[PDB]
Structures are given as C-alpha cells and as structure tokens.
Subunit: 451 residues, 2 copies
C-alpha cells in the first residue's frame, strides 16, 4: 500500500501533462509538419500523410474548442497524450508518425513554436500599454507637476513627459522581444535524441513547413538549448522592472500627501477594517509580481547551470516558470493599461506642489549672475530670498518688487516672467526636454510610430 | 467585506487579477480555526455574548468539517479570498451574527496568522521528511560499510572512502537543515492576531490569551511590524534553498555513480527509465528531477526578497505574492526529500567495480608521502618526491605498488619493503582513524552515533 503510494508519488513527481498541456496546439501542428518530412524520406506514402493530417486537424479543432479534456487523461505528457488520441483515430499509423523523431527534438520544437505565439501576444499587449500611455500624455500636457530626484522636488515636469518616459522603456522592451524572436526562430526538428535523425530529411525544408526561418546547425545543441527561455525571461524581468517603477511612481502620486492622481473604482479595492480606504491594489500587485518573474529567471539559470549535454530530465523544469512569468507579464501589461484608462490627474494639486519646490531659485540665481552679482554672493542672496519666501508661505514670484529689491537692488520688473513655471518649462527645449512644444512633438511622433 | 466607500464595481479583469481565492483556499482550515479563537477574544471585550460566540463556533465548526471533507468546493465560489468566503458562508448560516465576527480585525492581521499556522504544520512535515531521509541514509550506511570506493575532489580520484562515509556526509548536511527548520519554527511561533490593520485592535483584548488559544508561544510586540512581517517566509525559503542545494549535490553524485563510466551503483526500476534493448542503462529520472527542481526553490526565494525589498510600512498588497511562492517551494522541497528516500531503498552498490576504481588514479600517493614522513622526510619534500614517482609510474602505466623497490629507491633511498602494506586499500582506510575519518572503526562509531541521535 505504501509502496503503491510511493510509486503514485513518483508518477506525479515525474509527469508533465499538468503544465505541458499548454503545448497541445504546437505539438499538433508540429506533428503535421513532421508527417510531410517522412514522405520525402519514404517512411510514409502520401495517403497515410493525408489521413494523419486529417486526424490532427480534427484533434486541433477539438483541443481549441475544449482544452480541459487533456487534463482528464492520465497520460504522462502532451506528446504521449496526442499520440494516444492519434491512435484512436488512425490506429498504429499514429505511432509510425514518431519514426525518426524523439521527444527531445519534439519538445524543443513545441516549446519554440509556443514562444513565437506568446511573443506575438506580448508584443500586442506591450504596444497597447505604449498607446495607453501616449493617450494619457495627450490628455495631460497641461499637468505641470514636480519632477523628482531622490524623491525631492526638482525641476518641474508635466504628467505627459512622465508618461512618455515609460513609453521609451516599453519601446526597448519591444525591440528586446523582436530580437529574441528572430534569434529563436530556428527549427530544432530532425535532431533525433541528440545525434540527428537517422534519415535524410531535409531539415531546412522541414523548418519552412514549421514556419521557422532556418534549421539548427548542431543536433547536440538543438536538444539541450534553452537560451530562448532565458532570454525571454530576461526580457520579461526587465519589462517587469519597468512596470514596478511605473507602479512605484503612481502609488506615490496616489498618496494623500501627494494627491496628484486619483484612480478609478474599477481598478482599486477597499479595506475589510477601515471604511475609508480606496487602495491602489492593481498597481501594488503589478510591482509585487516583479519577483515571480525574477524568480522564474533565476530558477531557469540555476537549472541550466552546470548541466551536462545533451538532454537531461532537469529540462522538464523549463516550462512552469516560463509559463507563469509570461502570463504574469501579459497580465501586468494589460492591467497597467486599464489603470491608465480611468486615471484622473489632479492638476491644481500637481501645480501647487511644483510651485512649493522653489526650483526657480536657480533661474533667480543666474538672473542675478546675468545682472553682474558674483556667483557665491548670488547663491547666498537667493538662499536668503528663499528662506524669507517660505517664511511668508509664498513662491519667489509672489514677493512684491520692493521686497525682492531688499535682497538685491538689481532685481527689476523683468524678473517675474523669468521666474514663471511656463518660462522654466520652455527653457528645456532640446530633444526630450520638458518644454510643452517638445513634449507635444514627442506625443505626435509616438502616435505615428505606434499606429 | 468592503464596498461602502465605492460607487462602482470592480472591472472583471481587475477581479481576476486581484483575487487570491484560487490559491489562498489552502488556508481554509487555518482561517476558520483563527476565526474561532477570534470569536473568543470578542466575548472578552463585550462585542459578542457567550451564546453568540457559542453559536458562531458551531457554524464555523460546520464549515471546518465541510472544508476538510472537500476543499475543492471552495473554488466553486467567486469570493475574493478565503476570508470573504468564510464570512459569506457564516452569514448564510447565522445571518446578522456573521457580520460581527470581523470586529476589530483586519485581513492583514488574519492572513498573517493563517500563514504562520500553516508554516507550523508544514515545518513539522519537512522535519518528518528530513528525518526519514537521514535515517534512510544511516541504514544505507549500515549496510555498505564494506563498500570501499574512490573519493573525489575536483571529480578527481583523491583518496579511498566508503559508500557508508558518503551516505553519512549527507546525514550531516540534513541535520543542519533540520536544526535550521527548528530555529525558524521558534522565531515564527509568535501570534500576530489582534494587531488590526497596522495600529492594533481598538479593543482591550488580551493578545497573550489569544496566542494561547491559537497554540502560539507568545504574541507579537508591535502591530506595525506584525502586519508587515514576512521574515518567516524568507527564512523558510532560504532553509528550503539550502536544503535543495544539498539534494542537488546528492543528485549529482548518484547520477555520476550511475554512469557506464563509473558503474558504482544500480538503482531501482521504480525510480528510473530505460529500454528493454539495453537493460543495463538506467536513466536516473528521480535524481535528475530533484536537481532540476533546485531552481524553482531558489526562484521563490529571490522572488520573495524582491517583492519585500523597498516596501514601506506596514501592510502592502504586494505581500499577497508570498503564498504561491512559499506553497510551491515547500511542496517541492517535501517531494524531493521523499524521492531522495525512494531512490535510497533498493539502491545496490556494485562492490567489485567500486573497489577496482578505488585502487586506480594513484589514490594511495598520500600514504607514500606519509610513509616518508614517518622515516623523517619533511612532508613538503615527501610530497614532491612522490609526485615524481607518480610521473614515472604513469610513464610505465603501473600503480605505485607495482613499482619494484629498486625503482622506488631512485626517488628516495629511505623506502624499504615495508612501503607495500602501506599502499594497500585497507591501510588507506585504517589510517584515517581520527573523528569523522574513514577508518572502519570511525565509520562504525559514526553510524552508531547517528542511529542513537535519530532513534
């Protein structure tokens, strides 16, 4: 009894179906393609290939329309599940299909086909966040707020420029995904268990049937290679780092202390104890989820580190992490878009905090330096003027001319336009600077580029 | 549990993203048991009458027995989490009374308690699994005291050892895992319940009495810390990570001993796969999976560290990410401890091959240096001398013992016919007579000591 329990434990420990069912569709189209290779190589007649294709097409439509059926079976993995469902439709012809093929090059192929499908969905979700960000930017070009270094008020910025910062981060995530795609777009099918098919299959022809751009150059490498999962996990970890920063900023902007931003009821939840709470749960989950992506990355690295060639059962650990991390990344991309959709920027509070920063003390200092006051003395004087202004509870620009002239006689009426928030924005007029004219052009450039 | 502050419902995609039920239902028993203890705190302080508490306990116990019978039923609900699920089922059963149970409590409070209760049970199981492995290793050692084999450093033939000694090496690793689990359990055996959402319950509850009801050793000293603390998850993950490193080395060793090249070990069919064509080759499936599974435990560790890093006080929603990581990592560690034990029974050590290999690679060269020392030759000099003898032995393709005396005396004139008994396999073992050494008497003393420590 406890022997049987132990054997059943071993079967659960060993089996992969419960996560690799996720590869059903890829295993099936992969099988279609192999079947054609076998014809070129004289194992299958053209008729057996058509019957096999027919049964695989029916199975594909059935898995699409009801994926939950796979997990009803006690098959050990999908390859064996698909094989079993093939034999029901076609008899021993569904075993003959595995001729010249191994589970090692089979799963390598399925996995890369899955990555292609998934990178595609990630590219879309990523482009959608960019577009959500750019749209948010368009509607908040007038939202002047404090920029931050060290979480201290620095030169003022606009909410729009803040959005386009994340657009840029996301644009690099997009090219990272594109590059990973091109690099993984190589068919490992026809590589046998480790040393190649024992048939004269045309692997480049086979790759074409699979939709891959070329075939792998080395069978040992083909069966042992999981770079694409490491690289996709890297891309995801960096993407999630981006989203964790976005979340951190929005959560600060969302504090009662800041009051910069109000989030929608759709994307927010309450407290079981505290009747007033409206918490940024979605933003917090997005940053909390950075860790599981990172863990998936670390785990895959550790799994592959020190692993001898060619194939090893350790490599069955390549899927759960990848699946979880890419699902997470996709969910976070969607959720970040959703948060933006309902966001309200509280413009007066943003501007009030911008003005309580005294960044224009700089502009005062070199107004004075431009008027001839020595550097050291200029800074001393503005320092004094700033202390007095906070004592009176007003911005520098709010001091009457008679008051400012007590700090330096050279200050005149022309000081006031030079101290304005608008003036300080308009000076940053180089590419990527925060002047409204530049931000406006960046939004337009991103609209055109994003479609 | 909330909604009065809200004018609009959650978006469907937010609900799927935010809900914890699909995994926190694992805490059902703990949640209900904590709720019972909380109902008692509430009497103490006038929120509930004695008969109201008795009535809540009845309904909670019904839920407990229902949930024990088929936990899966929980997942039929669209409840946000296990806490809302319990409260909702209480209300169905007792009406308005069910709306009273959450007085003075928060989910921050509740989940912190539920998770520590679950850790206690899980650590216990890990401890049990760790001890069976130790004791399975000890028994394998018992039965393989005579299996001289090569010892390795750098995967190079070092000095002879025995398979018993190898086994006991892993016993020592596991015993430190065991003590790490015990120390972690002590630190975590502290009740956070009664700390509200961060600042305390607004009630004169006796939190040490509450701890007693829950089976904890004491109550936490600071509400802010209590609702925000996940040290115990990091500490358990880190113990699991170390434990999994040990298992990965165990895996690496056996997979190596199982090669056609070594041939030291035959494993059971129960734990391997292979082909009827080549019944000699067994793929070490369980072992490969044990070492492969090290990563996900390492990943859970890194992941929880990252999620906790830079988080302000007190509770934050990020902390909902603790459970999935911990569940996976401790389940993995438990399964690997069980499979390691499964691999050990029916394992067979192939003695003739082990012994043959133990006599190769000039693994007796230390004995010659030591022999030179005993004749007065400074160890460093002896070492150099023997190294050169090895270079000549390699050149002749002979073991040191097969070098004629006249040849050996070219290296040192002090060498006489008594080197030869010193080069034997049995003498390599006998000479290592200090504690933790490989002599037959030391290994026997170590086996007997491990048997006593574990019995």
């Amino acid at each position: 009894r406890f022997t049987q329990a132990a054997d059943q434990r071993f079967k659960q420990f060993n089996d992969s179906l419960r996560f690799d069912y996720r590869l059903a569709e890829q295993d099936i189209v992969g099988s279609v393609a192999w079947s054609k290779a076998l014809v070129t190589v004289g194992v299958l007649t053209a008729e057996e290939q058509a019957q096999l294709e027919e049964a695989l097409n029916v199975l594909l439509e059935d898995v699409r329309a009801r994926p939950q059926q796979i997990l009803e079976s006690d098959a050990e993995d999908i390859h064996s599940w698909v094989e079993g469902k093939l034999i029901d439709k076609v008899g021993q012809l569904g075993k003959k299909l595995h001729t010249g093929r191994s589970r090692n090059d089979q799963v390598a192929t399925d996995l890369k086909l899955w990555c292609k499908d998934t990178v595609s969905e990630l590219l879309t979700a990523n482009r959608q966040l960019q577009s959500a960000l750019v749209e948010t930017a368009q509607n908040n070009q007038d939202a002047v707020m404090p920029g931050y270094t060290h979480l201290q008020r620095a030169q003022p910025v606009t909410f729009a420029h803040w959005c386009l910062a994340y657009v840029e981060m996301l644009a690099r995530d997009e090219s990272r995904l594109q590059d990973a795609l091109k690099r993984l777009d190589v068919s490992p099918l026809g590589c046998g268990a480790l040393a190649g098919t024992a048939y004269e299959i045309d692997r480049e022809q086979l790759a074409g049937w699979l939709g891959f751009a070329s075939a792998t150059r080395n069978s040992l490498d083909s069966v042992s290679d999981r770079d694409h999962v490491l690289e996709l996990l890297s891309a995801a970890a960096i993407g999630m780092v981006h989203l964790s920063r976005f979340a951190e900023d929005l959560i600060f902007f969302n504090t009662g202390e800041a009051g910069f931003v109000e989030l929608s009821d759709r994307v927010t939840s309450g407290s079981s104890l505290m009747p007033q709470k409206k918490n940024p749960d979605a933003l917090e989950l997005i940053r909390g989820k950075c860790g599981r992506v990172q863990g998936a990355l670390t785990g895959m690295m550790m799994t592959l580190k020190g692993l001898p060639l060619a194939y090893n059962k350790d490599m069955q650990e390549d899927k759960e992490g990848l699946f979880d991390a890419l699902d997470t990344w996709l969910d976070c991309l969607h959720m970040a878009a959703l948060v933006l959709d309902g966001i309200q920027v509280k413009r007066p509070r943003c501007q009030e905090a911008a003005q309580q920063g005294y960044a224009n003390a700089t502009e005062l200092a070199d107004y004075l330096v431009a008027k001839g006051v020595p550097f050291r003395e200029a800074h001393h004087i503005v320092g004094e003027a700033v202390v007095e202004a906070i004592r009176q509870g007003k911005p520098l620009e709010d001091l009457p001319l008679s008051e400012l002239q007590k700090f330096s006689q050279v200050i005149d009426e022309d000081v006031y336009p030079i101290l304005s928030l608008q003036s300080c924005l308009d000076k940053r007029a180089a590419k990527g600077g925060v002047s409204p004219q530049q931000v406006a052009q960046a939004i337009a450039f991103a609209q055109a580029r994003l479609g």
